[PDB]
Amino acid sequence: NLLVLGIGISVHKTDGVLRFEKYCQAHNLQYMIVGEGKKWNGGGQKINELLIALESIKDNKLIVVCDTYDLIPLSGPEEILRKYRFLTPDNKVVFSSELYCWPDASLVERYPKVDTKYKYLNSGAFMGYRDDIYEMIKNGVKDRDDDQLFFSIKFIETDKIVLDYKCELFQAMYRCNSDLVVHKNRIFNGYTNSYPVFAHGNGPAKKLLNHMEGYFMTEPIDGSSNTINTFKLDNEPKVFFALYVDSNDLSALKQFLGKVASIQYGNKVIYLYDRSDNEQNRKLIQISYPNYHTGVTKYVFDDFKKSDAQFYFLLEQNCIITKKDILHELIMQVKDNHRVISPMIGYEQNSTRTNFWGDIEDGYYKRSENYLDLAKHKVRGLWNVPYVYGVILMHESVVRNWDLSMVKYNDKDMDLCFSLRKHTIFMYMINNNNYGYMV
Amino acid sequence: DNLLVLGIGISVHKTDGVLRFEKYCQAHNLQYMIVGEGKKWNGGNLESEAGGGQKINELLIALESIKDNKLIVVCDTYDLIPLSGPEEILRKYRFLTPDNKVVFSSELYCWPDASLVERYPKVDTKYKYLNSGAFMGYRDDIYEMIKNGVKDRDDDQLFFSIKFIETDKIVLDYKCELFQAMYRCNSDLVVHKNRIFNGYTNSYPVFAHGNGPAKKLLNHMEGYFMTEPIDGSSNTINTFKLDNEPKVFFALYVDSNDLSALKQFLGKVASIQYGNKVIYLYDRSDNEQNRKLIQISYPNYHTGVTKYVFDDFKKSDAQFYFLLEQNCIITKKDILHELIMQVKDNHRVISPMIGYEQNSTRTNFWGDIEDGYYKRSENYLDLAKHKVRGLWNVPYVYGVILMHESVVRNWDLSMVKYNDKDMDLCFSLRKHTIFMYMINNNNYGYMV
Numbered sequence: 109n110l111l112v113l114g115i116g117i118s119v120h121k122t123d124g125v126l127r128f129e130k131y132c133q134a135h136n137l138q139y140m141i142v143g144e145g146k147k148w149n150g151g152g153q154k155i156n157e158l159l160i161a162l163e164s165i166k167d168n169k170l171i172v173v174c175d176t177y178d179l180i181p182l183s184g185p186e187e188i189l190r191k192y193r194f195l196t197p198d199n200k201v202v203f204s205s206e207l208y209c210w211p212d213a214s215l216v217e218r219y220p221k222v223d224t225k226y227k228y229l230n231s232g233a234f235m236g237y238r239d240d241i242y243e244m245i246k247n248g249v250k251d252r253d254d255d256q257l258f259f260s261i262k263f264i265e266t267d268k269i270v271l272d273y274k275c276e277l278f279q280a281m282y283r284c285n286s287d288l289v290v291h292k293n294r295i296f297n298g299y300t301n302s303y304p305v306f307a308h309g310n311g312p313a314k315k316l317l318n319h320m321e322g323y324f325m326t327e328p329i330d331g332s333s334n335t336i337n338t339f340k341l342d343n344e345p346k347v348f349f350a351l352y353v354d355s356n357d358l359s360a361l362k363q364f365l366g367k368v369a370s371i372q373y374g375n376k377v378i379y380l381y382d383r384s385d386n387e388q389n390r391k392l393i394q395i396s397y398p399n400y401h402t403g404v405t406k407y408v409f410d411d412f413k414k415s416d417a418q419f420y421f422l423l424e425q426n427c428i429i430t431k432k433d434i435l436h437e438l439i440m441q442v443k444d445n446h447r448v449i450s451p452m453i454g455y456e457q458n459s460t461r462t463n464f465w466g467d468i469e470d471g472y473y474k475r476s477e478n479y480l481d482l483a484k485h486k487v488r489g490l491w492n493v494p495y496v497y498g499v500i501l502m503h504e505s506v507v508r509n510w511d512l513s514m515v516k517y518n519d520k521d522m523d524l525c526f527s528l529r530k531h532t533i534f535m536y537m538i539n540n541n542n543y544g545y546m547v
Numbered sequence: 548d549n550l551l552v553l554g555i556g557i558s559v560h561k562t563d564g565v566l567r568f569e570k571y572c573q574a575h576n577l578q579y580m581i582v583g584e585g586k587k588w589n590g591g592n593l594e595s596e597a598g599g600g601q602k603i604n605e606l607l608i609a610l611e612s613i614k615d616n617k618l619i620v621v622c623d624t625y626d627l628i629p630l631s632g633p634e635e636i637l638r639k640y641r642f643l644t645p646d647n648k649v650v651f652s653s654e655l656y657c658w659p660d661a662s663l664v665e666r667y668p669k670v671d672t673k674y675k676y677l678n679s680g681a682f683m684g685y686r687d688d689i690y691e692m693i694k695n696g697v698k699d700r701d702d703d704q705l706f707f708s709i710k711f712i713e714t715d716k717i718v719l720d721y722k723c724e725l726f727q728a729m730y731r732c733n734s735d736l737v738v739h740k741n742r743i744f745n746g747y748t749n750s751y752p753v754f755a756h757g758n759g760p761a762k763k764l765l766n767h768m769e770g771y772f773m774t775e776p777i778d779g780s781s782n783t784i785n786t787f788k789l790d791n792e793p794k795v796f797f798a799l800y801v802d803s804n805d806l807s808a809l810k811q812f813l814g815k816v817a818s819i820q821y822g823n824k825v826i827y828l829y830d831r832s833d834n835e836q837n838r839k840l841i842q843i844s845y846p847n848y849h850t851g852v853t854k855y856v857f858d859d860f861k862k863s864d865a866q867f868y869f870l871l872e873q874n875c876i877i878t879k880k881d882i883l884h885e886l887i888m889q890v891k892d893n894h895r896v897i898s899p900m901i902g903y904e905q906n907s908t909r910t911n912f913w914g915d916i917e918d919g920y921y922k923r924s925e926n927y928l929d930l931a932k933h934k935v936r937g938l939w940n941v942p943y944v945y946g947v948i949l950m951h952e953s954v955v956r957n958w959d960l961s962m963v964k965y966n967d968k969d970m971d972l973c974f975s976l977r978k979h980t981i982f983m984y985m986i987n988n989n990n991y992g993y994m995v
């Protein structure tokens with residue numbers, strides 16, 4: 109009765125596609141990921157891989173076709189089918205609407221005139237019968253052709269497409285901040301008076317969807333999650349501790365190593381990466397920590413990749429961990445699209461200054477609407493944020509499969525986060541407990 | 548494993564408070580019984596005095612019929628809802644008391660005897676004192692404490708406070724894991740993921756208790772909670788029609804001293820689409836000169852009326868009472884169909900939100916009240932501008948009100964406090980724990 113075709117063309121899965129899959133599963137939506145396992149080469153490749161997928165669907169199924177990296181469903185098939193039937197009694201293909209006419213601004217005068225601001229087609233989500241969609245795309249396109257232009261022209265030049273002007277099925281979120289609010293585990297659009305099913309953080313609006321993600325749920329919360337706030341795994345995966353130290357500040361080095369040594373975890377290997385090139389501390393340090401390296405000024409992944417460890421645990425010398433069972437606690441949260449997790453810590457004398465950024469502007473720190481709420485623990489959980497620092501747990505499927513060594517901002521911590529953002533790998537801050545402090 | 552919730556609901560007729568409790572219990576698969584159903588309350592005026600001993604007396608009676616040693620929750624129902632189910636409750640109980648003691652709610656204040664302050668255990672937290680509106684333990688242990696009974700007008704909270712201080716039978720839920728007494732805890736509490744989160748204790752309390760004046764906080768939060776995922780297509784089609792119309796009694800409050808206003812209003816009322824109706828006109832005018840003309844169109848016409856009247860309705864076979872004031876202009880013709888479709892469970896009094904024609908953010912509901920008059924609530928403007936839509940539990944509604952017969956037939960809606968018909972109707976409903984729901988789902992009309 110319904111199949112969702114999510115476009116997810118990549119050799120390795122992004123967190124965007126993993127999040128999409130989790131929300132489909134939560135809402136009982138049957139899906140397939142179009143292009144899974146293939147190399148990405150705009151957006152016409154979406155149409156070409158779609159055509160392949162449709163060729164293998166024999167019968168005339170009702171389908172949704174949608175983006176995955178920046179999009180989640182918030183309801184299930186029953187609501188979707190009610191809305192489709194209302195929107196198009198004669199079974200045409202329904203496309204998302206949006207605020208802007210692109211990529212060809214000259215189509216403005218060829219679109220139907222409407223009272224609403226939601227005037228134009230967005231190709232990132234649509235719904236209709238397999239045969240009808242197949243008929244429109246059956247000749248293929250160029251990989252580097254624009255899929256949005258392709259369908260905009262079809263809308264203007266044929267009677268095959270209807271636009272979702274009232275945002276019943278689909279929401280293109282960009283520049284619609286003032287219309288949207290989180291209410292009862294949904295987005296409500298007060299301009300249209302609707303609860304859109306598919307939330308599309310199109311273009312820069314990935315930041316708004318990622319912001320809202322921490323307020324949605326895929327299942328009711330277990331309110332006893334932290335009633336007992338001690339954690340111990342049944343089976344411990346191997347964790348590679350990557351310690352970024354500076355023996356030029358010997359007092360800080362000693363304080364930090366003492367705290368790391370008190371983290372309770374059996375199945376570990378510890379590497380020290382010292383930015384100093386002065387060899388005078390090697391004898392003393394190596395007695396306790398043989399895997400000691402000097403003159404290191406970048407984050408290092410080669411030792412990890414050559415190991416059999418399952419997790420990379422990055423620790424900076426100015427981050428003091430006091431919660432001894434923290435690795436057990438953190439590993440219990442690594443599932444689905446949660447693969448990079450950073451415990452929230454603040455300066456002792458200044459607890460509003462923490463190791464995460466809630467927002468970013470032109471690459472630098474911006475105060476988000478919920479930053480102070482998070483930093484003061486007014487709400488707790490996992491939070492999709494643009495930058496995390498100094499205490500970072502990463503699953504091997506991130507470190508082994510993606511380039512984390514891209515350069516833009518020169519500072520090692522800013523370039524790690526830049527790399528993750530570029531790959532659609534999400535950083536989750538966690539503030540469930542008192543974990544430590546920065547010095 | 549097993550759990551039974553014993554909600555205290557001593558009344559001949561059910562309040563909306565108990566109906567809301569029952570709905571949330573059912574939503575969370577909590578097995579429950581209502582203690583005291585069918586009996587008259589004789590426990591005192593708890594809004595302004597000590598009391599509540601009758602709750603212990605009716606509990607005792609109820610426990611006599613639970614022969615085996617079941618794990619039970621006992622709780623208030625008029626101002627209290629559960630937000631999770633039995634699995635979470637049992638995990639928390641077992642963590643809080645490995646030796647199976649009776650767990651009581653905590654609260655901020657030492658009530659009703661302020662001199663017990665020096666007798667309580669000293670603790671770091673502000674949640675220092677016992678609240679008897681929710682507790683959990685084994686039937687035999689609770690039975691043992693209450694087996695002799697008390698006076699109906701005795702204070703139940705005092706009774707258990709003394710037991711906590713003088714025995715080892717009770718422990719307090721200091722961290723608000725099972726229970727939250729919400730009064731004066733506003734800054735601690737936030738709505739998040741269909742729960743209350745307490746940032747002071749770092750907990751998600753199961754039972755949300757609007758104790759004392761905090762009924763206003765719980766009623767406010769109610770509009771943001773759900774008992775089931777919402778149906779996002781609820782207003783995709785915004786026309787409504789009942790094929791089998793229940794009988795509706797239209798009670799029109801009119802003033803023929805402004806004849807042009809009266810005619811404009813009646814022309815809108817006559818375009819409300821509804822067949823199975825009876826229409827009464829209650830005119831505040833004492834001038835009889837318009838009787839002959841009006842009665843041609845509306846034979847059920849009465850003059851000199853300055854109060855809301857329910858006796859004609861009670862003599863009828865109508866199932867709903869639809870109150871309409873002359874300055875309320877209804878433009879949505881299918882409105883009664885729309886409103887009747889929302890009447891279920893604890894939703895029995897429903898008022899469509901309309902604004903003044905020249906000033907749409909001044910509406911026919913009040914979000915808060917101070918010494919009886921309007922006060923601006925935290926979400927009033929959001930509601931007035933349709934930033935969020937639905938049903939909202941508010942202290943005052945005016946001018947367009949649909950009431951189920953189970954309210955009108957069974958409760959005194961004619962109590963006097965302000966000597967003002969609209970203010971005194973809402974006062975009466977608040978007194979009885981009958982809730983007023985504003986609804987803002989569609990464009991309904993306007994006030995003049």
Ligand SMILES: O=c1ccn([C@@H]2O[C@H](COP(=O)(O)OP(=O)(O)O)[C@@H](O)[C@H]2O)c(=O)[nH]1
Pocket residue numbers: 114115116117118143148151154174175176177178232309310311312
């Ligand atoms: O490596 C890639 C890049 C993009 N896409 C798909 O193309 C969609 C459109 O790109 P994006 O959503 O970034 O564009 P926007 O909606 O911001 O214009 C993404 O969600 C994916 O579904 C993909 O499958 N693989």
Ligand SMILES: O=c1ccn([C@@H]2O[C@H](COP(=O)(O)OP(=O)(O)O)[C@@H](O)[C@H]2O)c(=O)[nH]1
Pocket residue numbers: 554555556557558583588590593594599602622623624625626680757758759760
């Ligand atoms: O007519 C009444 C009045 C009170 N109660 C019960 O007594 C409790 C305590 O009164 P309330 O909760 O109104 O007050 P508070 O917790 O503020 O004392 C109610 O919740 C009911 O469970 C009752 O059963 N019938």
Ligand SMILES: OC[C@H]1O[C@H](O[C@@H]2[C@@H](O)[C@H](O)[C@@H](CO)O[C@H]2O)[C@H](O)[C@@H](O)[C@@H]1O
Pocket residue numbers: 593594596597598599623654656658659678679680681702703704705728758759760
């Ligand atoms: O008096 C018995 C009554 O006590 C509790 O209710 C209120 C209490 O929490 C508050 O501190 C005082 C003063 O505002 O008012 C009390 O009515 C308890 O919640 C209730 O169940 C109990 O019967």
Ligand SMILES: OC[C@H]1O[C@@H](O)[C@H](O)[C@@H](O)[C@@H]1O
Pocket residue numbers: 352353354383424425426427
């Ligand atoms: O990168 C290792 C360390 O280098 C030092 O020079 C800085 O003061 C620390 O904040 C940092 O943790």
Ligand SMILES: OC[C@H]1O[C@@H](O)[C@H](O)[C@@H](O)[C@@H]1O
Pocket residue numbers: 289290319320323477478
């Ligand atoms: O929009 C998602 C959330 O954003 C936060 O910044 C606000 O404080 C919340 O009230 C809101 O639910």
Ligand SMILES: OC[C@H]1O[C@@H](O)[C@H](O)[C@@H](O)[C@@H]1O
Pocket residue numbers: 800801802831872873874875
């Ligand atoms: O109560 C009936 C009517 O009386 C008139 O005098 C008032 O101006 C109206 O606002 C009211 O609806």
Ligand SMILES: OC[C@H]1O[C@@H](O)[C@H](O)[C@@H](O)[C@@H]1O
Pocket residue numbers: 737738767768771925926929
């Ligand atoms: O506390 C319940 C609700 O109250 C409203 O007044 C706020 O605007 C919401 O953000 C909040 O969730």
Ligand SMILES: OC[C@H]1O[C@@H](O)[C@H](O)[C@@H](O)[C@H]1O
Pocket residue numbers: 340341344372373374375
């Ligand atoms: O010393 C006790 C600790 O030993 C660690 O190896 C283990 O990871 C912890 O869970 C705890 O058992």
Ligand SMILES: OC[C@H]1O[C@@H](O)[C@H](O)[C@@H](O)[C@H]1O
Pocket residue numbers: 874909910911912913945969
């Ligand atoms: O006529 C009574 C009405 O008066 C209006 O001025 C007010 O906004 C309404 O809430 C209601 O009180």
Ligand SMILES: [Mn+2]
Pocket residue numbers: 175176177178179232308309310311
């Ligand atoms: Mn997209």
Ligand SMILES: [Mn+2]
Pocket residue numbers: 623624625626627680756757758759
């Ligand atoms: Mn109570």
